[PDB]
From Swiss-Prot, chain A:
Biological source species: Saccharomyces cerevisiae (strain ATCC 204508 / S288c) (Baker's yeast)
Quaternary structure and partners: TFIIF is composed of three different subunits: TFG1/RAP74, TFG2/RAP30 and TAF14.
Function: TFIIF is a general transcription initiation factor that binds to RNA polymerase II. Its functions include the recruitment of RNA polymerase II to the promoter bound DNA-TBP-TFIIB complex, decreasing the affinity of RNA polymerase II for non-specific DNA, allowing for the subsequent recruitment of TFIIE and TFIIH, and facilitating RNA polymerase II elongation.
Family named by the database record: Belongs to the TFIIF beta subunit family.
Other noteworthy facts: Present with 520 molecules/cell in log phase SD medium.
Protein name (database record): Transcription initiation factor IIF subunit beta
Cell compartment(s), UniProt: Nucleus
UniProtKB/Swiss-Prot annotation, chain B:
C4-type zinc finger span: 110-138
Note: Present with 35900 molecules/cell in log phase SD medium.
Complete-protein stretch covered: 6 to 191 of 482
Location of this chain's protein in the cell: Nucleus
Purpose: Recruits TFIIH to the initiation complex and stimulates the RNA polymerase II C-terminal domain kinase and DNA-dependent ATPase activities of TFIIH. Both TFIIH and TFIIE are required for promoter clearance by RNA polymerase.
Record domain HTH TFE/IIEalpha-type: where: 4-94
Similarity annotation: Belongs to the TFIIE alpha subunit family.
Transmembrane annotation, as ranges: none
Protein's UniProt name: Transcription initiation factor IIE subunit alpha
SUBUNIT field: TFIIE is a tetramer of two alpha (TFA1) and two beta (TFA2) subunits.
Species lineage: Eukaryota, Fungi, Dikarya, Ascomycota, Saccharomycotina
UniProtKB/Swiss-Prot annotation, chain C:
Compartments (UniProt record): Nucleus
DNA-binding positions: 1-60
Endpoints of the signal sequence: none
Protein name: Transcription initiation factor IIE subunit beta
Assembly behavior: TFIIE is a tetramer of two alpha (TFA1) and two beta (TFA2) subunits.
Main function: Recruits TFIIH to the initiation complex and stimulates the RNA polymerase II C-terminal domain kinase and DNA-dependent ATPase activities of TFIIH. Both TFIIH and TFIIE are required for promoter clearance by RNA polymerase.
The encoding gene: TFA2
Additional notes on this entry: Present with 1150 molecules/cell in log phase SD medium.
Family to which the UniProt record says this protein belongs: Belongs to the TFIIE beta subunit family.
Length: 64, 168, 143
């Protein structure tokens, strides 16, 4: 949920920025992000995930 | 063209698997396609469509006209026209079935020498001392399916009857 | 960020093992009562929207496959999983139609346990006997 609020706050971010926040291995961060976010490998923002309700998603995460 | 389609389905049953039969039926559904139309129509890829196209090219089953769409938007258009040619398919099937029958219609060997002899060689290889066919150099003894081919030929006979019905 | 809510709700539908009302989802998933949660269920094929009130369930087969092939008469390919979703547990019916050699099935060139089913438009010794060597004059002699 926190990472998603970052995604509305940042259209581009990194597994490093996410691992720094979540203190979890980038491999785990890369799995879930594949679901919400998509990767852009070209341009200035290359190697960074971009997105495609947030409160409903957070409550769904709390339920699961 | 129902009889020709039935002959093509019989050829698909005899020659190759079901995917090729389905591709031929898909071409039969739609009048004309150009080089990309099977790919839009099918879930197979173009490279694999290419192995199948090479397999069709190996035989006379179908025909290709190679045409460009002239209008000068970029590189124009490579359109290929795949239209079945009935005479070539009829000729190839007849040659194959007759050749198959000839193969179905179509002896002495020595165990140690691994040589091979025939009837004329039988007159030569006969010895008066013993009763036997003896090898030439090694003087070794000489030693030496159709019904099963006939049953498989029963399958060939229905195809021949279908060809006769298509002819008349 | 509406993509995640559907999965946490659906996997919850798998965990609960029973359908959940939209209000029961919206209360349990703590969301404002909305059409989008239902609309994601109406959109998602892994969840069934029930015309009676709210209900959301997780998500004749040979005849359905034959009718699909007949409608497919213009279409030269179909997806295996989509046909199974249209007629739950249709993979077996697809394989049976294959063995019958009518709606025939195509064995997976990717994982040899899987099989694709396809829509029907409707031995090498044997094959070489049926092919052999493959000209115009013998055809004319044949004609």
């Amino acid at each position: 949920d926190y990472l998603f609020k970052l995604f509305d706050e940042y259209d581009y971010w990194s597994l490093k920025g996410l691992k720094e926040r979540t203190r979890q291995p980038e491999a785990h961060l890369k799995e879930c992000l594949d679901k919400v976010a998509t990767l852009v490998k070209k341009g200035p923002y290359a190697f960074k995930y971009t997105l495609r309700k947030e409160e409903e998603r957070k409550a769904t995460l709390g339920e699961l | 063209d129902d009889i020709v389609k039935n002959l093509l389905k019989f050829v698909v049953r005899g020659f190759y698997g079901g995917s090729f039969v389905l591709v031929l039926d898909a071409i039969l559904f739609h009048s004309v396609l150009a080089e990309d139309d099977l790919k839009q129509l099918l879930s197979i890829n173009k490279t694999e469509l290419g192995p199948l196209i090479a397999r069709l090219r190996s035989d006379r089953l179908i025909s290709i006209h190679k045409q460009r769409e002239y209008p000068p938007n970029s590189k124009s258009v490579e359109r290929v026209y795949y239209y079945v040619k009935y005479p070539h398919a009829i000729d190839a099937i007849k040659w194959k079935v007759h050749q198959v029958v000839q193969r179905l219609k179509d002896g002495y060997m020595c165990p140690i020498c691994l040589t091979k002899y025939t009837q004329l060689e039988a007159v030569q290889l006969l010895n008066f001392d013993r009763t036997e066919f003896l090898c030439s150099l090694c003087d070794e003894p000489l030693v030496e399916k159709q019904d099963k081919l006939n049953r498989l030929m029963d399958q060939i006979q229905p195809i021949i009857d279908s060809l006769k019905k298509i002819d008349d | 960020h509406d993509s995640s809510k559907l999965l946490w709700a659906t996997e919850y539908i798998q965990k609960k093992g029973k359908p959940v009302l939209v209000n029961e989802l919206l209360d349990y998933l703590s969301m404002k009562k909305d059409d989008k949660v239902i609309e994601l269920l109406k959109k998602l094929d892994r969840i069934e929207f029930d015309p009676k009130k709210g209900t959301f369930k997780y998500l004749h087969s040979p005849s359905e496959l034959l009718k699909l092939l007949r409608s497919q008469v213009t279409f030269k390919g179909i997806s295996c999983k989509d046909l199974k979703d249209g007629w739950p547990q249709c993979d077996e019916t697809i394989n049976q139609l294959e063995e019958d050699s009518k709606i025939l099935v195509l064995r997976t060139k990717k994982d040899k346990t899987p099989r694709y089913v396809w829509y029907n438009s409707g031995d090498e010794e044997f094959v070489k006997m049926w092919e052999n060597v493959q000209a115009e004059l013998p055809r004319k002699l044949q004609d």
